[PDB]
Design a protein around this motif. Sequence first.
Motif, PDB file in Angstrom:
ATOM      1  N   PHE A  25      -0.495  -7.251  -9.536  1.00  0.00           N
ATOM      2  CA  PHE A  25      -1.236  -7.782  -8.392  1.00  0.00           C
ATOM      3  C   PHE A  25      -0.975  -9.274  -8.190  1.00  0.00           C
ATOM      4  O   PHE A  25      -0.853 -10.044  -9.151  1.00  0.00           O
ATOM      5  N   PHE A  26      -0.942  -9.695  -6.928  1.00  0.00           N
ATOM      6  CA  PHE A  26      -0.736 -11.116  -6.603  1.00  0.00           C
ATOM      7  C   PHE A  26      -1.344 -11.461  -5.274  1.00  0.00           C
ATOM      8  O   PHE A  26      -1.786 -10.581  -4.543  1.00  0.00           O
ATOM      9  N   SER A  27      -1.347 -12.759  -4.960  1.00  0.00           N
ATOM     10  CA  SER A  27      -1.685 -13.241  -3.635  1.00  0.00           C
ATOM     11  C   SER A  27      -0.698 -14.338  -3.303  1.00  0.00           C
ATOM     12  O   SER A  27      -0.333 -15.116  -4.180  1.00  0.00           O
ATOM     13  N   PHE A  28      -0.270 -14.405  -2.055  1.00  0.00           N
ATOM     14  CA  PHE A  28       0.601 -15.498  -1.636  1.00  0.00           C
ATOM     15  C   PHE A  28      -0.115 -16.861  -1.653  1.00  0.00           C
ATOM     16  O   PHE A  28       0.540 -17.896  -1.545  1.00  0.00           O
ATOM     17  N   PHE A  29      -1.440 -16.863  -1.785  1.00  0.00           N
ATOM     18  CA  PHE A  29      -2.239 -18.093  -1.936  1.00  0.00           C
ATOM     19  C   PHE A  29      -2.392 -18.567  -3.372  1.00  0.00           C
ATOM     20  O   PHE A  29      -2.938 -19.647  -3.632  1.00  0.00           O
ATOM     21  N   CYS A  30      -1.953 -17.729  -4.293  1.00  0.00           N
ATOM     22  CA  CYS A  30      -2.227 -17.882  -5.716  1.00  0.00           C
ATOM     23  C   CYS A  30      -1.179 -18.777  -6.391  1.00  0.00           C
ATOM     24  O   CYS A  30      -0.016 -18.422  -6.455  1.00  0.00           O
ATOM     25  N   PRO A  31      -1.590 -19.967  -6.861  1.00  0.00           N
ATOM     26  CA  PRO A  31      -0.604 -20.901  -7.419  1.00  0.00           C
ATOM     27  C   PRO A  31       0.146 -20.341  -8.628  1.00  0.00           C
ATOM     28  O   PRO A  31       1.372 -20.485  -8.675  1.00  0.00           O
ATOM     29  N   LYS A  49      13.796  -4.707 -18.295  1.00  0.00           N
ATOM     30  CA  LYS A  49      13.543  -4.211 -19.641  1.00  0.00           C
ATOM     31  C   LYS A  49      12.728  -2.932 -19.697  1.00  0.00           C
ATOM     32  O   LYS A  49      12.466  -2.415 -20.786  1.00  0.00           O
ATOM     33  N   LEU A  50      12.310  -2.420 -18.542  1.00  0.00           N
ATOM     34  CA  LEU A  50      11.523  -1.191 -18.525  1.00  0.00           C
ATOM     35  C   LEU A  50      12.370   0.025 -18.862  1.00  0.00           C
ATOM     36  O   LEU A  50      13.527   0.116 -18.445  1.00  0.00           O
ATOM     37  N   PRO A  51      11.782   0.960 -19.628  1.00  0.00           N
ATOM     38  CA  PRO A  51      12.388   2.237 -20.016  1.00  0.00           C
ATOM     39  C   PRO A  51      12.852   3.022 -18.802  1.00  0.00           C
ATOM     40  O   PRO A  51      12.343   2.801 -17.705  1.00  0.00           O
ATOM     41  N   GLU A  52      13.827   3.904 -19.002  1.00  0.00           N
ATOM     42  CA  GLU A  52      14.245   4.868 -17.987  1.00  0.00           C
ATOM     43  C   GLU A  52      13.067   5.660 -17.406  1.00  0.00           C
ATOM     44  O   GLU A  52      12.221   6.177 -18.143  1.00  0.00           O
ATOM     45  N   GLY A  53      13.000   5.725 -16.080  1.00  0.00           N
ATOM     46  CA  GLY A  53      12.000   6.536 -15.407  1.00  0.00           C
ATOM     47  C   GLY A  53      10.774   5.803 -14.890  1.00  0.00           C
ATOM     48  O   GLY A  53      10.282   6.107 -13.800  1.00  0.00           O
ATOM     49  N   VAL A  54      10.282   4.835 -15.661  1.00  0.00           N
ATOM     50  CA  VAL A  54       9.080   4.096 -15.277  1.00  0.00           C
ATOM     51  C   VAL A  54       9.366   3.113 -14.123  1.00  0.00           C
ATOM     52  O   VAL A  54      10.242   2.242 -14.197  1.00  0.00           O
ATOM     53  N   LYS A  55       8.651   3.354 -13.024  1.00  0.00           N
ATOM     54  CA  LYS A  55       8.742   2.598 -11.777  1.00  0.00           C
ATOM     55  C   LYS A  55       7.711   1.470 -11.681  1.00  0.00           C
ATOM     56  O   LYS A  55       6.644   1.526 -12.307  1.00  0.00           O
ATOM     57  N   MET A  56       8.041   0.452 -10.886  1.00  0.00           N
ATOM     58  CA  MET A  56       7.196  -0.737 -10.726  1.00  0.00           C
ATOM     59  C   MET A  56       6.546  -0.860  -9.352  1.00  0.00           C
ATOM     60  O   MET A  56       7.191  -0.675  -8.324  1.00  0.00           O
ATOM     61  N   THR A  57       5.269  -1.203  -9.347  1.00  0.00           N
ATOM     62  CA  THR A  57       4.515  -1.336  -8.112  1.00  0.00           C
ATOM     63  C   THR A  57       3.902  -2.723  -8.036  1.00  0.00           C
ATOM     64  O   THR A  57       3.373  -3.213  -9.026  1.00  0.00           O
ATOM     65  N   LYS A  58       3.968  -3.356  -6.874  1.00  0.00           N
ATOM     66  CA  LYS A  58       3.349  -4.672  -6.714  1.00  0.00           C
ATOM     67  C   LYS A  58       2.472  -4.692  -5.479  1.00  0.00           C
ATOM     68  O   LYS A  58       2.925  -4.335  -4.395  1.00  0.00           O
ATOM     69  N   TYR A  59       1.211  -5.082  -5.653  1.00  0.00           N
ATOM     70  CA  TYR A  59       0.277  -5.114  -4.538  1.00  0.00           C
ATOM     71  C   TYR A  59      -0.339  -6.474  -4.286  1.00  0.00           C
ATOM     72  O   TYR A  59      -0.662  -7.213  -5.222  1.00  0.00           O
ATOM     73  N   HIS A  60      -0.588  -6.750  -3.012  1.00  0.00           N
ATOM     74  CA  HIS A  60      -1.259  -7.975  -2.608  1.00  0.00           C
ATOM     75  C   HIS A  60      -2.777  -7.771  -2.623  1.00  0.00           C
ATOM     76  O   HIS A  60      -3.232  -6.635  -2.582  1.00  0.00           O
ATOM     77  N   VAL A  61      -3.546  -8.858  -2.745  1.00  0.00           N
ATOM     78  CA  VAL A  61      -5.001  -8.765  -2.808  1.00  0.00           C
ATOM     79  C   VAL A  61      -5.666  -9.572  -1.709  1.00  0.00           C
ATOM     80  O   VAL A  61      -5.093 -10.537  -1.196  1.00  0.00           O
ATOM     81  N   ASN A  62      -6.896  -9.187  -1.389  1.00  0.00           N
ATOM     82  CA  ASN A  62      -7.650  -9.806  -0.306  1.00  0.00           C
ATOM     83  C   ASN A  62      -8.484 -10.998  -0.738  1.00  0.00           C
ATOM     84  O   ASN A  62      -8.862 -11.795   0.101  1.00  0.00           O
ATOM     85  N   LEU A  72      -2.233 -11.178   5.047  1.00  0.00           N
ATOM     86  CA  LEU A  72      -1.091 -11.113   4.153  1.00  0.00           C
ATOM     87  C   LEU A  72      -1.036  -9.774   3.419  1.00  0.00           C
ATOM     88  O   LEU A  72       0.046  -9.263   3.128  1.00  0.00           O
ATOM     89  N   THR A  73      -2.192  -9.194   3.120  1.00  0.00           N
ATOM     90  CA  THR A  73      -2.211  -7.868   2.515  1.00  0.00           C
ATOM     91  C   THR A  73      -1.623  -6.860   3.508  1.00  0.00           C
ATOM     92  O   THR A  73      -0.799  -6.011   3.151  1.00  0.00           O
ATOM     93  N   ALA A  77       1.891  -4.733   3.152  1.00  0.00           N
ATOM     94  CA  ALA A  77       2.019  -3.323   3.512  1.00  0.00           C
ATOM     95  C   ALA A  77       3.229  -3.099   4.435  1.00  0.00           C
ATOM     96  O   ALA A  77       4.025  -2.184   4.205  1.00  0.00           O
ATOM     97  N   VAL A  78       3.393  -3.951   5.451  1.00  0.00           N
ATOM     98  CA  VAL A  78       4.542  -3.844   6.334  1.00  0.00           C
ATOM     99  C   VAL A  78       5.831  -4.044   5.548  1.00  0.00           C
ATOM    100  O   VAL A  78       6.799  -3.306   5.752  1.00  0.00           O
ATOM    101  N   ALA A  79       5.838  -5.030   4.650  1.00  0.00           N
ATOM    102  CA  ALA A  79       6.988  -5.275   3.782  1.00  0.00           C
ATOM    103  C   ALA A  79       7.369  -4.030   2.959  1.00  0.00           C
ATOM    104  O   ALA A  79       8.546  -3.703   2.806  1.00  0.00           O
ATOM    105  N   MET A  80       6.367  -3.352   2.419  1.00  0.00           N
ATOM    106  CA  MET A  80       6.629  -2.157   1.618  1.00  0.00           C
ATOM    107  C   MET A  80       7.113  -1.005   2.490  1.00  0.00           C
ATOM    108  O   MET A  80       8.025  -0.262   2.113  1.00  0.00           O
ATOM    109  N   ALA A  81       6.488  -0.838   3.649  1.00  0.00           N
ATOM    110  CA  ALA A  81       6.881   0.246   4.546  1.00  0.00           C
ATOM    111  C   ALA A  81       8.328   0.095   4.998  1.00  0.00           C
ATOM    112  O   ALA A  81       9.077   1.065   5.043  1.00  0.00           O
ATOM    113  N   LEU A  82       8.744  -1.134   5.287  1.00  0.00           N
ATOM    114  CA  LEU A  82      10.091  -1.353   5.783  1.00  0.00           C
ATOM    115  C   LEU A  82      11.092  -1.540   4.658  1.00  0.00           C
ATOM    116  O   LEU A  82      12.294  -1.552   4.910  1.00  0.00           O
ATOM    117  N   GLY A  83      10.590  -1.697   3.432  1.00  0.00           N
ATOM    118  CA  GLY A  83      11.413  -1.999   2.270  1.00  0.00           C
ATOM    119  C   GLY A  83      12.137  -3.318   2.374  1.00  0.00           C
ATOM    120  O   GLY A  83      13.327  -3.422   2.054  1.00  0.00           O
TER     121      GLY A  83
END
Length: 188
Positions: A25-31, A49-62, A72-73, A77-83
């Motif tokens: 989790f992150f925020s674009f306001f977060c130093p 360094k992550l093992p085979e198979g394990v995927k990574m998710t990153k989310y913005h917070v309000n 920004l959240t 979402a738009v960033a993720m939808a469009l990749g």
Amino acid sequence: AQYEDGKQYTTLEKPVAGAPQVLEFFSFFCPHCYQFEEVLHISDNVKKKLPEGVKMTKYHVNFMGGDLGKDLTQAWAVAMALGVEDKVTVPLFEGVQKTQTIRSASDIRDVFINAGIKGEEYDAAWNSFVVKSLVAQQEKAAADVQLRGVPAMFVNGKYQLNPQGMDTSNMDVFVQQYADTVKYLSEK
């Protein structure tokens, strides 16, 4: 042991079922998030360094930055939808924290346009229900872990990284410790 519950990580007293394997989790306001992403490159060094198979998710917070924080959240979402995460992450961080040229939803939209996302395509996504459900997913995930600060990383809805139990004298060494810890937790 070398890795100890309560030291490099903590265990959620209330584990979250169906959670993503690795959830940041992150925020674009977060130093410190700017440091994590722009200087330390935490997400990237964890991935390498992550093992085979394990995927990574990153989310913005309000919960930082008020009305612009929520925009920004939705933009994330738009960033993720469009990749296009890897095209807008740097200008969004720099627009909010470095140049401070992001003050409105329109300024956020400018970042995407300059990054080559078409206006019609950005606007379509922004207003789409697929993006609304992506906003929902981000909100639900933060709610599931009672999130009250960022940056934060969770492994399997069970463990929360604890970087304050780490030496920061050398930033290369901190990053690899952080990453090695995520790998360890992921093999638990």
